[PDB]
Design a protein around this ligand. Sequence first.
Ligand SMILES: NC(=O)c1ccc[n+]([C@@H]2O[C@H](COP(=O)([O-])OP(=O)(O)OC[C@H]3O[C@@H](n4cnc5c(N)ncnc54)[C@H](OP(=O)(O)O)[C@@H]3O)[C@@H](O)[C@H]2O)c1
Ligand SMILES: NC(=O)c1ccc[n+]([C@@H]2O[C@H](COP(=O)([O-])OP(=O)(O)OC[C@H]3O[C@@H](n4cnc5c(N)ncnc54)[C@H](OP(=O)(O)O)[C@@H]3O)[C@@H](O)[C@H]2O)c1
Ligand SMILES: [N+]
Lengths: 324, 324
Amino acid sequence: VQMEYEKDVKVAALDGKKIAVIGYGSQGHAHAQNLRDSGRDVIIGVRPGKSFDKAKEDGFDTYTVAEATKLADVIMILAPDEIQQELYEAEIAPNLEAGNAVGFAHGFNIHFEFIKVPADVDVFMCAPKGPGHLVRRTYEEGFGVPALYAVYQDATGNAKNIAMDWCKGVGAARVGLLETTYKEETEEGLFGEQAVLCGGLTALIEAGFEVLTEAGYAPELAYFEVLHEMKLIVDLIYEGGFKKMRQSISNTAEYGDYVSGPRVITEQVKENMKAVLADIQNGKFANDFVNDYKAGRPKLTAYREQAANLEIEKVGAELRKAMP
Amino acid sequence: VQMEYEKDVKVAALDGKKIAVIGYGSQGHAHAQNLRDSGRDVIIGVRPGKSFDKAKEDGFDTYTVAEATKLADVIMILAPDEIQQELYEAEIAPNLEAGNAVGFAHGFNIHFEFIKVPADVDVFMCAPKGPGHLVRRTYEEGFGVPALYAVYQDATGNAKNIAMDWCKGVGAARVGLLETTYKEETEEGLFGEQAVLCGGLTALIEAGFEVLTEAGYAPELAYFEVLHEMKLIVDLIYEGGFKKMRQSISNTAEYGDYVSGPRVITEQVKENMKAVLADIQNGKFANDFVNDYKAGRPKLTAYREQAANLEIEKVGAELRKAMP
Ligand SMILES: NC(=O)c1ccc[n+]([C@@H]2O[C@H](COP(=O)([O-])OP(=O)(O)OC[C@H]3O[C@@H](n4cnc5c(N)ncnc54)[C@H](OP(=O)(O)O)[C@@H]3O)[C@@H](O)[C@H]2O)c1
Ligand SMILES: NC(=O)c1ccc[n+]([C@@H]2O[C@H](COP(=O)([O-])OP(=O)(O)OC[C@H]3O[C@@H](n4cnc5c(N)ncnc54)[C@H](OP(=O)(O)O)[C@@H]3O)[C@@H](O)[C@H]2O)c1
Ligand SMILES: [N+]
């Protein structure tokens, strides 16, 4: 297992395919525009609204989801996670034909089988390691965003070449591709964002800010010491790992890192992470997410309002405004 | 208090002061170069070596530490924390006169009283929220790095104006200043790097990587899901807090953030952080750091060799090499 590049995309499987991109938001605009600049035959299927208008004004032949699917050989579904299933059953599935291919940028609905694509139709994935605006901008500047690719079912024998050529067309093969499975992409992706990148990180910052402000330290200073200075730390890790970061910080900071990291993130925290992982693997989290959507997003509603009221967010907004 | 800027620097207290920067590392070079371009009389004092004539070659009147201190009104000490004390006793303290001012960029040795400056000499601090190369670069490009300032003892009545004019001369007043105390800067700064930015963060990432690889996931994919994509997340928080970050990530990632963050970082984790803070406040951590240095850094030595052997660091180095 090592990374693949344009030279490893040995068949241009998107040649002569009509491509429908379903949705025209962050990913949809990026995938469609990069593919068009790479010379592919791209149309957009999306509901009426600002995405429909933005696609038309960008010069794309723009249809309903149903009509775009009917016209297409390759259909990439970039609606939001919780919308895809209902949109697939009503608008996409009736308009598929044998030998088509359906793509996704994240494996959630296919892996947990909220969507089942018929067995004479390929299912592939190109999952860029970045948001849509970055996927577009790096492409325009001559490189790209690395990506995973996978195939869930291969009816034609062309599903993997289609997946890799998709990655090449959106610029990902310029920087690096990694093959995976739908299962691993979904479970590792959900785990990483929950336990480390998004959940773990924000909860860690928040706990540190609370300890400081509850001990009597000024919150403005606390904002700088647990959040603002994180960017320079993570930039160093991104470029050169823990080694480069620990070379840059003072020796006191470095010694404190080694000594106090393990006091905060303990074996028990690791066990907490294992419980997070288990609820991803057993479908509990997936059902919880979709059930919250079916109920009108009541849990997400309370979470989003509670987050808006956080002291660190209020202090941070005022500081970021006082700082060009 | 909120941020102060160039308009809040009431007195150009460095006017006609002879300024010695002690050390010519990343910070020493940045501080001395910026102050020179701002118009101040800067000389360097450092041990012989490539620092000594890096400075020689950049046109700085360079001297011993003893002789540069003898000549200066303002002496800013930018040597590493564990070196400052022996350097101060042997080389700086005998060459101070009443009415001088001694500066630091971090409060550790003054706050914990490993160094005690005579009561007829001011002690101030300018602590940029950035490393040397960034303090120099941003100044060259027209702005700067924000900074804290503080005064530990004010003999002349000019110590705060000296501190704030030092901020101004290195470019920090162009973007924002926050007054603090030596005690708060030291304690909050040690706490942040230990519990959140450095210690907590690398420990969290490593715990996530361990959970994934021990559950049978390939380390290469795990590296992307707990480390590589953190830069994009932290960049978003830096620009717009949790709110902007959570708008850009998918809806499953955002829901997973709210649900699983608190399962990983629990009340017990917060208690662990409180114990970290207590050992900063009571001097235990500071004495442990200084004592490790006096014993020949045996704890730091074992930490560093263990870190070089981490699986995430080996995998990361290979993947970063495969990604220009
Ligand atoms: N966020 C990330 O960083 C990231 C990274 C990798 C993969 N992904 C995955 O990419 C997919 C999400 O794509 P995205 O980020 O581009 O989402 P998005 O920015 O929120 O855009 C969603 C698009 O789908 C449209 N849409 C919503 N409901 C629709 C419906 N019934 N019928 C037709 N169109 C509809 C929306 O149109 P309107 O404007 O009218 O609402 C919009 O154009 C998910 O699978 C996600 O897991 C996300
Ligand atoms: N790391 C950060 O991002 C950061 C941020 C804010 C504040 N600070 C504080 O900045 C201070 C450290 O400065 P720094 O980052 O510039 O460290 P540095 O890059 O390692 O520079 C150390 C300088 O001091 C010299 N030096 C070492 N021992 C000496 C001795 N006995 N006599 C004379 N000179 C000696 C070194 O010369 P040689 O090259 O010959 O060794 C070198 O020029 C600390 O107080 C730190 O807490 C650091
Ligand atoms: N220091």
